[PDB]
Amino acid sequence: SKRSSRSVEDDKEGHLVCRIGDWLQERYEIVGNLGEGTFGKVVECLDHARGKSQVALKIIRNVGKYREAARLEINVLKKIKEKDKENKFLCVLMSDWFNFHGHMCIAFELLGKNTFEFLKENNFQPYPLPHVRHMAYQLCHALRFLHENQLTHTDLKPENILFVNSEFETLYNEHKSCEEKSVKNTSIRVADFGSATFDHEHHTTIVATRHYRPPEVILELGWAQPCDVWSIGCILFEYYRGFTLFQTHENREHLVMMEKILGPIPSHMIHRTRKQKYFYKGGLVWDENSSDGRYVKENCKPLKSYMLQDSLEHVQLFDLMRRMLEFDPAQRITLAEALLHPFFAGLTPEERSF
Ligand SMILES: CN1CCN(c2ccc3cc2OCC(=O)N(C)CCCN(C)Cc2c[nH]c4ncnc(c24)N3)CC1
Ligand SMILES: [Cl-]
């Protein structure tokens, strides 16, 4: 059952050619293709050495830079597995890893759709508040655990969060006259730890995908765990409205958006940054008459204007969000503090215990 090197074929970009029926490491039998990415691909396998159970296999491209990154991801995943003996912290648990002819492969449990793909297949109709609450709680629980072990994710976004099972019921919305999908179980796992960084490792100047990137990173003031809290704030917003909080493509614009939505950047941050090009007379400087300047002015409103209802549970979500989106990383709510916020008194007994 071993694969000959004749068996192994790669395309122009370094991706493994996989077909239904193929075998890896004399153990995994490919049964479906789950998706692709700039990193490689994700296939569904049966693990014959564990009674034919289902696994998702992440197959990394055979390119040096991808391979090297995968090796650090495995170290992070190993740490997670050793610290979560009882399987309760909701970060995906590696079952195996290997090098298949230069493709690093990592095996995980089979999960459902990512929260972004689900949101898109629902035509960007947002999750109901109770789903936002349960998912928020789980994100805060999982990243609390990662933070307590001297790790920072650095790249949180909706596609990195998967449902355990993404089966849904189809309901109808009187308010907006259309169909809506509602996931039946809102259990989730944080995946991809391909940028997760230890406290003792080198911290690059810029991390995070732009839309989820915090101000300390744009102003090159250094980052640590609070970076993940900012990203969680932007994520919860996007689950609640269904659209991105910061629909931005460059720094100066991104900072204006921050000020329109959140209020003024604090002075002590401005005096400390080397990125003085964004400032004049101690205040953010920009062209209001430009395409970008007109876009922000028409489209970016104070955070509270985005509430869809005015009842207590919505007031509590927005209070938590504001506290996640504090400009000053040192003042931003920690995830241990977030888990004690009144928003989460709203959870069912079942959801709170996992
Ligand atoms: C347009 N397409 C874009 C790609 N889409 C998929 C498909 C399948 C999975 C993930 C995505 O996207 C997100 C993604 O690529 N990552 C977070 C990196 C891979 C993390 N994977 C290895 C985590 C993982 C563990 N168990 C899994 N079970 C199922 N699916 C997984 C699983 N991953 C589909 C839609
Ligand atoms: Cl690949």
Ligand SMILES: [Cl-]
């Ligand atoms: Cl300007």
